[PDB]
Design a binder for these strands. Structure first.
Ligand SMILES: [Mg+2]
Ligand SMILES: [Mg+2]
Ligand SMILES: [Mg+2]
Ligand SMILES: [Mg+2]
Ligand SMILES: [Mg+2]
Ligand SMILES: [Mg+2]
Ligand SMILES: [Mg+2]
Ligand SMILES: [Mg+2]
Ligand SMILES: [Mg+2]
Ligand SMILES: [Mg+2]
Ligand SMILES: [Mg+2]
Ligand SMILES: [Mg+2]
Ligand SMILES: [Mg+2]
Ligand SMILES: [Mg+2]
Ligand SMILES: [Mg+2]
Ligand SMILES: [Mg+2]
Ligand SMILES: [Mg+2]
Ligand SMILES: [Mg+2]
Ligand SMILES: [Mg+2]
Ligand SMILES: [Mg+2]
Ligand SMILES: [Mg+2]
Ligand SMILES: [Mg+2]
Ligand SMILES: [Mg+2]
Ligand SMILES: [Mg+2]
Ligand SMILES: [Mg+2]
Ligand SMILES: [Mg+2]
Ligand SMILES: [Mg+2]
Ligand SMILES: [Mg+2]
Ligand SMILES: [Mg+2]
Ligand SMILES: [Mg+2]
Ligand SMILES: [Mg+2]
Ligand SMILES: [Mg+2]
Ligand SMILES: [Mg+2]
Ligand SMILES: [Mg+2]
Ligand SMILES: [Mg+2]
Ligand SMILES: [Mg+2]
Ligand SMILES: [Mg+2]
Ligand SMILES: [Mg+2]
Ligand SMILES: [Mg+2]
Ligand SMILES: [Mg+2]
Ligand SMILES: [Mg+2]
Ligand SMILES: [Mg+2]
Ligand SMILES: [Mg+2]
Ligand SMILES: [Mg+2]
Ligand SMILES: [Mg+2]
Ligand SMILES: [Mg+2]
Ligand SMILES: [Mg+2]
Ligand SMILES: [Mg+2]
Ligand SMILES: [Mg+2]
Ligand SMILES: [Mg+2]
Ligand SMILES: [Mg+2]
Ligand SMILES: [Mg+2]
Ligand SMILES: [Mg+2]
Ligand SMILES: [Mg+2]
Ligand SMILES: [Mg+2]
Ligand SMILES: [Mg+2]
Ligand SMILES: [Mg+2]
Ligand SMILES: [Mg+2]
Ligand SMILES: [Mg+2]
Ligand SMILES: [Mg+2]
Ligand SMILES: [Mg+2]
Ligand SMILES: [Mg+2]
Ligand SMILES: [Mg+2]
Ligand SMILES: [Mg+2]
Ligand SMILES: [Mg+2]
Ligand SMILES: [Mg+2]
Ligand SMILES: [Mg+2]
Ligand SMILES: [Mg+2]
Ligand SMILES: [Mg+2]
Ligand SMILES: [Mg+2]
Ligand SMILES: [Mg+2]
Ligand SMILES: [Mg+2]
Ligand SMILES: [Mg+2]
Ligand SMILES: [Mg+2]
Ligand SMILES: [Mg+2]
Ligand SMILES: [Mg+2]
Ligand SMILES: [Mg+2]
Ligand SMILES: [Mg+2]
Ligand SMILES: [Mg+2]
Ligand SMILES: [Mg+2]
Ligand SMILES: [Mg+2]
Ligand SMILES: [Mg+2]
Ligand SMILES: [Mg+2]
Ligand SMILES: [Mg+2]
Ligand SMILES: [Mg+2]
Ligand SMILES: [Mg+2]
Ligand SMILES: [Mg+2]
Ligand SMILES: [Mg+2]
Ligand SMILES: [Mg+2]
Ligand SMILES: [Mg+2]
Ligand SMILES: [Mg+2]
Ligand SMILES: [Mg+2]
Lengths: 63, 84, 50, 99
RNA sequence: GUGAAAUACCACCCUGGCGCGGCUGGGGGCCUAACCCUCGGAUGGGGGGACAGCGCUUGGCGGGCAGUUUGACUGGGGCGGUCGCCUCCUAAAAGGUAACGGAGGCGCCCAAAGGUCCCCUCAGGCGGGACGGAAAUCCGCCGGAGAGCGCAAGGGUAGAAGGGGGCCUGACUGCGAGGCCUGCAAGCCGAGCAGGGGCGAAAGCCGGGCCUAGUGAACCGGUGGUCCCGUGUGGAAGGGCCA
RNA sequence: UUGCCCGGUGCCGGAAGGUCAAGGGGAGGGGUGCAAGCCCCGAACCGAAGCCCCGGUGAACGGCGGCCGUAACUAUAACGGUCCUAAGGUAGCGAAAUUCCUUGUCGGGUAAGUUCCGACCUGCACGAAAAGCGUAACGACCGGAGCGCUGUCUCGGCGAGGGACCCGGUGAAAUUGAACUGGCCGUGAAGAUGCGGCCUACCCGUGGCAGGACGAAAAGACCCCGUGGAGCUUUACUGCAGC
RNA sequence: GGUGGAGCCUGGGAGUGAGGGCGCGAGCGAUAACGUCCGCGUCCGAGCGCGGGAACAACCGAGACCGCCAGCUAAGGCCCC
RNA sequence: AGCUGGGGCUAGGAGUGAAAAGCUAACCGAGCCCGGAGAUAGCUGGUUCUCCCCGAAAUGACUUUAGGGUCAGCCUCAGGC
RNA sequence: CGUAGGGAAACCGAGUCCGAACAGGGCGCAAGCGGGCCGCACGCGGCCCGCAAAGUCCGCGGCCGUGGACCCGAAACCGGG
RNA sequence: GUGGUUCGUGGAGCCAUGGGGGAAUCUGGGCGGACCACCGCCUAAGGCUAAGUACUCCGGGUGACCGAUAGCGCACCAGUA
RNA sequence: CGGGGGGAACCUGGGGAACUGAAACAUCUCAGUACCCAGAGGAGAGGAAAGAGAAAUCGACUCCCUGAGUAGCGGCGAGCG
């Protein structure tokens, strides 16, 4: 019956216009105590490939 | 059935391979940023138009060609002569 | 790290932060230092805890 | 996958997934470039736009997008800055509405 | 005079104790009339008695019972050992490369062991030397690095990364061309622009540390800010975003 | 007859103290209202068993290892000392249903005895009520010995009857890829009737034997694997009954 | 240079994640193992299709579309079988 | 502490047991029947007509993973270059 | 469903998000025509065209998800008898 | 203390209610997702009520349903032997 | 006067599993399902707002299609909705 939208996905990925899948970099959630600004700074979304193909299949209906 | 107590070891651990070495040989065209060499120490000194990173990481800063130069007891180098 | 203890740096002119590590025992206690803010940028910062 | 942590090592960014009563009854706005708007003439308005081939029940009308604004009156709930400009070449601006 | 400290007298108070009194708690005693048990049937008489029993709720004990969990590698399995990270070898002169192959380290640390400017150059060998081991510190030659560089090992290095002194906090904020490495995401190098600074006359150099270990995705929550959302409206509660 | 040790666990008793639930109490603080207010947060302190704690208790769970020194050779140690634990085996037993070394060593019985019986005590690892040590009588219990008597045996023989054999009658079974199904050396997935080379060998039965057809039967009961299952245990986890 | 069931890009369908022998370079082992673990190569696997090697997955020869009572060769052979 | 007929009672985490986990209708560490139910089975087995073209893998990383998997490597088909 | 993409969001919009920044950078957009005909402006309008800008709908086929999901097989668990 | 709802303690309202305490009669009382103030919505603690909907033992009508190992377990004197 | 039993499914109410799924497992899932019981009938239930929730709105209940795999719930896991 009507396939279901994986809400665990719907909560960490925004699927783009060209079809690419986007999510936030992993790291800076609590890791830190002293990481270069460069590292803690360089965290603002990214690509994924062959793996997002899989992602998109879970976000069916919500296109 | 014979399996008398079997001894043991320990020194069975190694480190990850770092894939170091020269990444671009002379004659090769390189854009600014292209990290030519990636040694650990100073095996290769930075030449004209070359930059050294935290880990003596040599990187070109000019869009041109590559080339080394042996200065003997002065240490080797690797400058990227500009595509002029 | 038990003795080092990681603290932050407040703008004193208000809020802000940056955060580093100390070393209570080893020549230390109370950290004052020049740090560039974001909420105006150009001031002195003290320790704190968080 | 199977055994090890799957690309679920990711991380909910989507700040705000919702409280318990749910979604908040909010007015949604659907843009429709004057580009398309220049398909017919007269005095285009919502409803006349939904019935056309754009908008449809998606609530409030907001004209803008590229395209060359046509000399005529256009009624909307909103207009983009650069859209309002384009209607310079003799057009309209019956904004507000909803009363 | 003794002592650590001085005593008449004067106070402000403290320690602990006893009384009389409010506030709050415990545990007995007597009563009968609820409840309980009894008397050749009793609207009654005995006995227990607001306890016990029973309802709701607190915490406890609780294999009597119930559902489950008790890792992998592995010259079978068990026992022992091991499990992530760093250095060297094995590795066959690019990179990579296995075994319960060989040999050692890490789970920190430094506010100076950081930034910059200016000076300085070692270890040993041989002389000569007050205490002086065979190295304390000296003096004279000779000595390109064998010394030093926080700690393993390797690479590197005095034309300094080593040793000393002065101001300093770039152990920046906003980014980030272009790359190394790579199944995934992670790791890594980073010129350059902007904001506001540090040192230098200046050229300039500074986005921690000679370098390669000193580490941990997500989820769940905490604390600062944000003012983004906030269930008819306003504010709140509660979230989000940044740290 | 039933020692020694109450430290720990259990059980019994215990109004000093430590900690601990609901609830009480509310210094103080917060959200909104123009306000009375209406909602919340919340520090002292008061709040049961329970655990801790203190005493006892062994025919309660249990524990009774060791290490030094010491007597008219030597050995031993009645005698002292020692301790992580609370204390370090009283009697009696003892190479025993218990002794690893072990066929211990002496003695007995035998021509010869890893067994047996009696001893010694170096008890790997007896011990007092999961009792110690004995004990007349009892036992289809297990050991060792004699006498008697034997086809047990040397070492077989014959005899009998019921089958087996043959005829008439009747008439199954497991098993079965198909078969035109021999030996030796080899070879082959390491053990071939089936490959090679050679040897042997007319065709078909009947009574017999059991070496092979890795013969039959049972999808190995041992072993490992499966994030399989059940029964059982506990100071594994989490609940529950019950108190 | 090289037109090859070569390459590159995008997408649909996979299967495979027990390998094995030989040669050479190392470890382990005892420079023992039809041993074991890596490295390049090659065959078997999937070429138990064909010739040679007496027989014989992987040694030597050689990549089987079908037919022929024709021919030349390969390894290995040319006394008889 | 005997044996035995007839009449009765106790049962599935339950009974009964001079105790073996014995016995409870010829297999009891949890009876039998029907049902949930086509339980689950990362395991074993089996998987049926013909021809033509191409043609693997048994590696790496991670995995309560190690005879199972996900991504990559290698095969195939369509389109593009 | 499709005709707007961005943002966590308010929101803005061919832009948008981070940022003080017209620095940068992450997502984004930027679609005609091979072309017969012909009204017969020395102009190609625009009818037409593939099927696109570009999508949808229905049919068919491959694979995937949820269902017993290729078929047969447990030891067992639970309910009522 | 719990159940119901998408809501598993959550900022947890709403509807039911086992326990304890315990009102008012429209100048009342419940609700609009903690709570408060506004603005609104609705009248709890009494009962009844066709139609539209569900099913198929039974009768009928149809079938790109079966055709005696199929189709119901039973085409037959079958829930029988 | 009535009641009692029977009735294939269907219906309401009172009670209410487990295997499974989460590639172990306990919250969660399976599922208020299977099943037991009581009741009712050709149906049963529900039913005229102490409703919905933002609309100067609708106006009993039931049933179908959408809304929507949305809003939300969730060891924010499986999955539920
Ligand atoms: Mg930032
Ligand atoms: Mg949709
Ligand atoms: Mg640098
Ligand atoms: Mg009475
Ligand atoms: Mg009385
Ligand atoms: Mg009385
Ligand atoms: Mg009472
Ligand atoms: Mg148990
Ligand atoms: Mg279970
Ligand atoms: Mg190499
Ligand atoms: Mg090499
Ligand atoms: Mg300095
Ligand atoms: Mg990357
Ligand atoms: Mg509000
Ligand atoms: Mg107030
Ligand atoms: Mg006997
Ligand atoms: Mg005879
Ligand atoms: Mg006969
Ligand atoms: Mg043979
Ligand atoms: Mg033969
Ligand atoms: Mg033959
Ligand atoms: Mg015969
Ligand atoms: Mg015989
Ligand atoms: Mg045999
Ligand atoms: Mg190819
Ligand atoms: Mg492909
Ligand atoms: Mg393998
Ligand atoms: Mg193997
Ligand atoms: Mg292997
Ligand atoms: Mg191979
Ligand atoms: Mg291999
Ligand atoms: Mg090979
Ligand atoms: Mg070898
Ligand atoms: Mg081998
Ligand atoms: Mg070999
Ligand atoms: Mg291997
Ligand atoms: Mg081949
Ligand atoms: Mg061959
Ligand atoms: Mg063969
Ligand atoms: Mg051959
Ligand atoms: Mg041959
Ligand atoms: Mg060919
Ligand atoms: Mg010839
Ligand atoms: Mg020849
Ligand atoms: Mg009798
Ligand atoms: Mg049972
Ligand atoms: Mg039962
Ligand atoms: Mg009993
Ligand atoms: Mg008996
Ligand atoms: Mg029993
Ligand atoms: Mg029986
Ligand atoms: Mg059982
Ligand atoms: Mg089921
Ligand atoms: Mg089955
Ligand atoms: Mg099955
Ligand atoms: Mg599987
Ligand atoms: Mg081919
Ligand atoms: Mg794959
Ligand atoms: Mg092609
Ligand atoms: Mg941009
Ligand atoms: Mg089956
Ligand atoms: Mg039952
Ligand atoms: Mg609930
Ligand atoms: Mg609730
Ligand atoms: Mg109540
Ligand atoms: Mg009440
Ligand atoms: Mg109410
Ligand atoms: Mg209420
Ligand atoms: Mg209310
Ligand atoms: Mg309401
Ligand atoms: Mg409200
Ligand atoms: Mg209302
Ligand atoms: Mg009413
Ligand atoms: Mg009424
Ligand atoms: Mg009714
Ligand atoms: Mg009715
Ligand atoms: Mg019907
Ligand atoms: Mg039939
Ligand atoms: Mg027939
Ligand atoms: Mg019939
Ligand atoms: Mg039949
Ligand atoms: Mg009736
Ligand atoms: Mg029902
Ligand atoms: Mg019910
Ligand atoms: Mg029911
Ligand atoms: Mg379950
Ligand atoms: Mg499971
Ligand atoms: Mg449910
Ligand atoms: Mg009717
Ligand atoms: Mg009705
Ligand atoms: Mg009707
Ligand atoms: Mg009414």
């Amino acid at each position: 019956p009507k396939m279901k939208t994986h809400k665990g996905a719907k909560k960490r990925v925004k699927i783009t216009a060209s079809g690419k899948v986007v999510a936030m970099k992993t790291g800076k959630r609590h890791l830190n105590w002293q990481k270069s600004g460069k590292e803690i700074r360089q965290k603002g979304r990214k690509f994924v490939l062959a793996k997002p193909e899989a992602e998109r299949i879970k976000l069916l209906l919500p296109y | 059935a014979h399996k008398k107590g079997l001894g043991s070891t320990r020194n069975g651990r190694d480190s990850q391979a770092k894939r170091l070495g020269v990444k671009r040989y002379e004659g090769q065209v390189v854009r600014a940023g292209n990290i030519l060499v990636r040694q650990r120490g100073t095996r290769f000194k930075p030449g004209k138009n070359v930059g050294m990173g935290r880990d003596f990481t040599l990187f070109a800063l000019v869009d041109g060609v590559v080339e080394f130069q042996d200065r003997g007891r002065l240490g080797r180098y690797v400058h990227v002569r500009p595509l002029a | 790290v038990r003795i080092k203890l990681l603290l932050e740096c407040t703008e004193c002119k208000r809020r802000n932060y940056a955060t580093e590590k100390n070393k209570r025992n080893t020549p230390n206690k109370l950290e004052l230092r020049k740090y560039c803010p974001w909420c105006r940028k150009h001031t002195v910062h003290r320790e704190v805890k968080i | 996958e199977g055994g090890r942590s799957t690309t679920l090592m990711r991380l909910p960014k989507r700040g705000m997934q919702g409280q318990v009563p749910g979604e908040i009854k909010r007015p949604r706005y659907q843009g429709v470039n004057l580009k398309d708007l220049a398909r017919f003439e007269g005095e285009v308005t919502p409803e006349l736009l939904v019935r056309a081939g754009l908008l449809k029940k998606g609530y409030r009308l907001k004209i803008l997008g590229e395209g060359e604004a046509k000399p005529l009156k256009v009624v909307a709930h909103a207009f983009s800055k650069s859209a309002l400009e384009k209607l310079k070449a003799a057009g309209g601006e019956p904004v507000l509405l909803e009363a």
